[PDB]
């Protein structure tokens, strides 16, 4: 079900730095959004706009070594003096408030840009080779030089006309020596491996760090006095651990080899815990949303643990779990600003949930497995632009995806799956939660869905008379499409004592119905006494009215259909009412012929290996052995052969040659056997 989701296209960017469009990481900061795809000449950083080519438009290259020394997308930044939002209004004046920097991976040489557009004028800065991992901005106009030894050498820029000063900040050899935790990123982005929240969450001039094991420190830097001031170093690895286990059960040897890896910090209000035991090949997750109540950056019990019903199944290419949310300030609802959670391995957009123990529910938009695969999806990096979701998609430019069991198989199969199969194209988010409500095994979720979703093309079009007339044709392609949905995702083959191939045999006995309902001669009056026995009615001109009851059910109704053919009497021997009988012949006699050409193209060994096991069961009139009904197609045999000694040798050759056409589909129970030698 599509809830509040807005999923279509945004645009496709200016290209000289979107020249490259390989899937990687992208440097996003909550300001108004900036977008990146790294390039190996330059780090072309753009600001996204819907005048799409250059008019408002920032695409500024920033330096990167064209050497074996190089940069990566999170290693070029946009430096804010006082992290805090004022980077707009430099978009054409080119002020100092959105500089940037790169200290080289093995070379450790700064190229420190003194403005956004003035780059000709660079300063060099040092801690020596291998003191690197990625760059972030801090508050003195400084830059975070993160090291993956867990260190951050705090490089205090003088804020006047830029110019860094080399010094060694907090952390020195302290986490160099730790190898008993991992500080080493398997998830990257300067929103992922680190976060400096500008106003996002409890962040606001607070440099954070969370390592791949949950080793969480916080600094604050006082721009005036130029100093890293540590405020915590606590492991949120002890915070979470115990109630990871008290949800999804891990057995003795499952614990023994099991890892939790905090894969994310969203300004220290979110921590993506990867519960994974190395024997399976599925990354399960718990969304440990840690909100602090009262005093912040320390242990709370509003540390709270949302057991996913989302399963990821690993792919070791296109791996990079990342979560970018525009409005992760929320511990209490909104549902008209974007604040939905997104996971992605890089090919999909997984609309997941949050704040469901932060408050009492929050009515968030559907959880579980959710895909997107609409045309050529692959994610360079999600983000947020103008406080709404951004997804920088590879070969479609930017795509917007921003958002502003029992019973779904029993009677909300007729609402909610009615909805997830009557569209699936414009937004495709609706097929996994609904069709894996179907697909997951209970004995009455696979026996009776394959009957009751085949009555949801019994409800196709909400009017029940549009769809029984001239959109009964359009209702015919939606019988067929509906059971396309069945076949690709495994609900057929699990069956009650009633045959499950009733759904198939009725779209043989549809082609008589459809012929009458478009082509109108006087064989539209056939469906009279058919209907007006079964239910007593409106009782009017129509008895093309209330065919939505006759739809999805070839049991007793073919019997009663034939009775108005037997109502065409009074004296018919000198030929006259035989014109009527020609007209009857010409359309529906090809449609009882069909079920040799309509049960050639499909059902050959879905109706010998489940038809003949179901033939064994009969009571007589119940539909089984009847396959176009014993003792009603024999009196229609005798209707055409009795027509031909009520007429000549010409109308009589027509009605006759098309009687002995149709002598084989009162055979076609065991005459599917043709290609083969088999209460």
């Amino acid at each position: 079900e599509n809830n509040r989701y807005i999923v279509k296209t945004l645009q496709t960017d200016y290209s000289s730095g979107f020249s490259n469009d390989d899937e990687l990481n992208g440097y996003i900061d909550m300001q108004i959004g900036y977008g990146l795809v790294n390039d190996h000449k330059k780090v072309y950083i753009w600001n996204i706009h819907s005048t799409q080519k250059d008019t408002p438009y920032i695409t500024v290259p920033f330096r990167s070594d064209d050497n074996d020394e190089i940069a990566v997308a999170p290693r070029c930044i946009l430096t804010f003096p006082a992290t805090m939002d004022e980077s707009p209004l430099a978009l054409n004046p080119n002020d100092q408030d959105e500089t940037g920097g790169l200290i080289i991976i093995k070379g450790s040489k700064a190229i420190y840009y003194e403005d956004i557009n003035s780059i000709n004028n660079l300063p060099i800065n040092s801690s020596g080779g291998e003191k690197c991992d990625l760059m972030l901005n801090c508050e003195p106009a400084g830059i975070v030089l993160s090291t993956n030894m867990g260190r951050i050498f705090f490089i205090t820029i003088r804020n006047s006309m830029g110019k860094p000063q080399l010094k060694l900040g907090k952390l020195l050899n302290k986490p160099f020596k730790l190898g008993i935790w991992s500080k080493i990123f398997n998830t990257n982005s300067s929103v992922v491996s680190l976060r400096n929240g500008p106003i996002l969450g409890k962040g606001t001039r607070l440099v954070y760090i969370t390592t791949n094991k949950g080793i969480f420190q916080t600094w604050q830097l006082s721009a005036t006095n130029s100093h890293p001031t540590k405020l915590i170093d606590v492991n949120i690895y002890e915070a979470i651990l115990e109630s990871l286990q008290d949800l999804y059960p891990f057995a003795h040897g499952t614990l023994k080899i099991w890892d939790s890896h905090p894969l994310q910090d969203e300004s220290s209000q979110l921590f993506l815990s990867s519960i994974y035991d190395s024997s399976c090949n599925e990354t399960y997750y718990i969304l440990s949303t840690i909100i602090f109540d009262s005093s912040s950056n320390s242990f709370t019990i509003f540390s709270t643990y949302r057991l996913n019903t989302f399963m990821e199944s690993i792919t070791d290419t296109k791996f990079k779990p990342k979560i970018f949310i525009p409005q992760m300030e929320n511990a209490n609802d909104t549902n008209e600003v974007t604040s939905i959670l997104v996971m992605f391995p890089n090919a999909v957009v997984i609309t997941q949930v949050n704040s469901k123990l932060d408050s009492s529910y929050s009515m968030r938009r559907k959880w579980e497995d959710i895909v997107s695969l609409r045309n050529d999806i692959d994610i360079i990096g999600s983000g947020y632009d103008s406080k709404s979701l951004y997804v920088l998609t590879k070969q479609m430019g930017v795509l917007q995806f921003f958002v502003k069991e029992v019973g779904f198989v029993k009677s909300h199969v007729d609402q909610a799956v009615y909805f997830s199969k009557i569209n699936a194209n414009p937004i495709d988010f609706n097929l996994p939660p609904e069709i894996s409500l179907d697909q997951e095994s209970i004995e009455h979720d696979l026996k009776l869905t394959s009957e009751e979703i085949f009555h949801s093309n019994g409800k196709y079009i909400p009017p029940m008379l549009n769809t029984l007339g001239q959109h009964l044709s359009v209702r015919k392609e939606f019988f067929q499409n509906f059971l396309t949905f069945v076949a690709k995702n495994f609900n057929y083959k699990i069956s009650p004592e009633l045959k499950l191939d009733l759904i198939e045999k009725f779209e043989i006995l549809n082609c008589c119905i459809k012929f009458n309902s478009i082509i109108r001669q006087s064989d539209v009056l056939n469906d009279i006494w058919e209907k007006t026995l079964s239910n007593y009615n409106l009782t009017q001109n129509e008895h093309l009215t209330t065919k939505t009851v006759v739809i999805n059910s070839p049991d007793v109704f073919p019997v009663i259909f034939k009775q108005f053919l037997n109502h065409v009497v009074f004296v018919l021997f000198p030929s006259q009412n035989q014109n009527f009988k020609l007209n009857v012949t010409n359309l529906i006699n090809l449609c009882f012929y069909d079920g040799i050409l309509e049960e050639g193209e499909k059902t050959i060994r879905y109706e010998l290996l489940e038809l003949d096991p179901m033939e064994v069961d009969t009571s007589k009139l119940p539909w089984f052995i009847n396959f176009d009904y014993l003792n009603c197609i024999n009196q229609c045999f005798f209707d055409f052969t009795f027509a031909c000694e009520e007429e000549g040798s010409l109308d009589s050759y027509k009605e006759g040659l098309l009687k002995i056409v149709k002598i084989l589909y009162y055979q076609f129970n065991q005459f599917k056997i043709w290609i083969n030698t088999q209460d």
Partner: protein, 859 residues
Amino acid sequence: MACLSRIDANLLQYYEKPEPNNTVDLYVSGSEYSNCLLLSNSEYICYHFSSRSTLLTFYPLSDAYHGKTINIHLPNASMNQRYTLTIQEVEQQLLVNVILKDGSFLTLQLPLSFLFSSANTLNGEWFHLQNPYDFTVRVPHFLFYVSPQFSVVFLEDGGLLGLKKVDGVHYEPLLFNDNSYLKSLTRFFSRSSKSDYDSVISCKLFHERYLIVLTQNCHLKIWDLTSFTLIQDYDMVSQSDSDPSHFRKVEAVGEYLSLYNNTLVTLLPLENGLFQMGTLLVLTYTFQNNIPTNLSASAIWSIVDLVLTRPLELNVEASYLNLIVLWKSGTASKLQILNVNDESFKNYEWIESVNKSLVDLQSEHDLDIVTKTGDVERGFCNLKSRYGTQIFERAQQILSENKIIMAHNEDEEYLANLETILRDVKTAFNEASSITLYGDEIILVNCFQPYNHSLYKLNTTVENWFYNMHSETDGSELFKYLRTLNGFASTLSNDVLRSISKKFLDIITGELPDSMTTVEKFTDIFKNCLENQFEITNLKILFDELNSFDIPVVLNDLINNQMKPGIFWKKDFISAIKFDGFTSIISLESLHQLLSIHYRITLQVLLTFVLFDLDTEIFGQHISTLLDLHYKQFLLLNLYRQDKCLLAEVLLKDSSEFSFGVKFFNYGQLIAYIDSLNSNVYNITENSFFMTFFRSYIIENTSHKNIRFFLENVECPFYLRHNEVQEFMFAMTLFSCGNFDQSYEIFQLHDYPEAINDKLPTFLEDLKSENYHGDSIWKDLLCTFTVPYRHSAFYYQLSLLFDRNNSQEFALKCISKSAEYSLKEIQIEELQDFKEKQHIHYLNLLIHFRMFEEVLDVL
């Protein structure tokens, strides 16, 4: 809210040299600061003091390009910087008091007749060295001229010291016993650090007696110089909303005090967010409120001046004072104006400055749709003038006119500077340093670099719009009209709107003929260029958005009060002598800011009667005037970028009221002066022509010096009298350049009922006078062919001149005209100058081609 905006300046765009006119190292034996001097001659020395502290440029502010430009090189540097630099005139000669660093004091004398006119005439000694008191081991950081009898020096070691002159040249100490050796250590002061004195960082006078220095830790120490004793000690860590537990103490000499009335202001950094305005009265120091400023750029603004002045013509004309709070932070600067509207400094009307250029607002809202700019082989005329020659010739050659230096490429100094100099459009020589009040009240921010200013100007309430439009609430219901018409125009690309603007040129030319209703024209526009280039939601949105504003009354307001001036006129313009760069920028840039805004206003309104057939003959006044205005607009958007050398001069030229420079002292003057030249461009909407006046003269001047954007100011419909006189001067356009087959044709194409009666005012520039054509070449030469003729007296005038500047074929071919197409051929001797002389001149140009006939029965 906000009215004043930047206009950036480089005065080397009006000329082709990248450098100042002249510079003369006149030896005494530049970027950092520039404050002018108040002089009684109303033309002010713009004293740019460098960072190097030993070069100091003296040149006229207006009269800038001409005059005389002198840099003195001091034999040693000044004792700190510009804080030991005090200039005023004491004898009609500028007395430049300096503490020389090594030990002594200096006094220079510079006349107002060798700075303000060309060449030197000052000679002998004019530099006087004297050591009144030992400054070798006593170090001051601040000189304070109080009187012409007292420029008292404030030591960091010792006390406060009076330094009284006794003849203007030589000084005598009159020591004060005010504190700066009884304090500077006490209990929040430190003499072991450059920080934290009770000695000065900024002193102002209060009434020729009381003397209120602000200190490093912001103490207004109030002294009384008839008794040398303390009056009241204040400390703004408790006269503030600022505690000393988050106070940035000032740790450098700097400006923070300003006055023009009572209003004594002290700003306090605390991470540069809470401004403070206090008040002083004859002491008793009142405190009112702290003003959160609107700032940007992480609040890394640093303050270099603050003055205030009496109320000004804005959108408002009333206030109390305009605190002129001047910020800067690298390549960019901003004048935010904390215009308090009273003694309550919590009430205000903020006035933002755009930090970028006039033409950097047009690449960030787009109006470069009317660029007609060259490349890099016509870059030597057009990129020369779009940046200045100054930026254009250089690319990393400039290393201290924008204060961005280089080191090497393993540094981020080379790369940075390389980028910054070619991004410089006119911005980043405008590194705003100080303010002075030119005339009476002209807010004249003089920046770091000589020959560049930030020109604040009335800009006017109608010269904001488009470029500011979601930050202002100035203008009326008309403001809101044009803002809802950006709900169409701006949603679309403007290059779509460029072609719709093209179809409006075509209405005037007549490819779309004028003899129809403008309903019918506009539906033919609706076939072309606005045919699924509406959005259907932009359609329906513009529709209801029109109807909610009452259309004829909001057009009525617009077209008759803004983009048509009335007659504006000389209201006492005193003028500068000589065409110079600084008065050329007044007459071109503020003008264009009014013209190209009216182009996007005309674009914007004539998009909204494309899409409807509600009558445009009820709008029949308004819509015609907007198209007549469009085509005269369009002339001056194809020549602004091309030349800033040319066009300033031509709107100087058009009245002797504007002479060739204007010195405006207020805004009664300047509202009128820009609304003169607007009315001249828009010749009302025809009160004469200035594709006749402006043009003919400058065709004979500078299309002989070969400007060829005069095919982009040709543009006339050529209906009415155009098809007589504009045919004449578009012929003469290529006669000036010597492309000669066009001259042959489009001269002879129109007939001439012209005789001596005059409707061509043409002045052949001789380069010493006007050879007055159309009258006093007509009454000469067409009268010595004896009775003017309707063809061929003119076609001697073509022919003769055409040989004279070489073109024997096209000449021959217009006298092979005038031989045969003699109108009098009865062979009588008073019309045998019209068939004599024109038959002799015919035969002259046939014997250098050596012919075959044409000497048949004409020999």
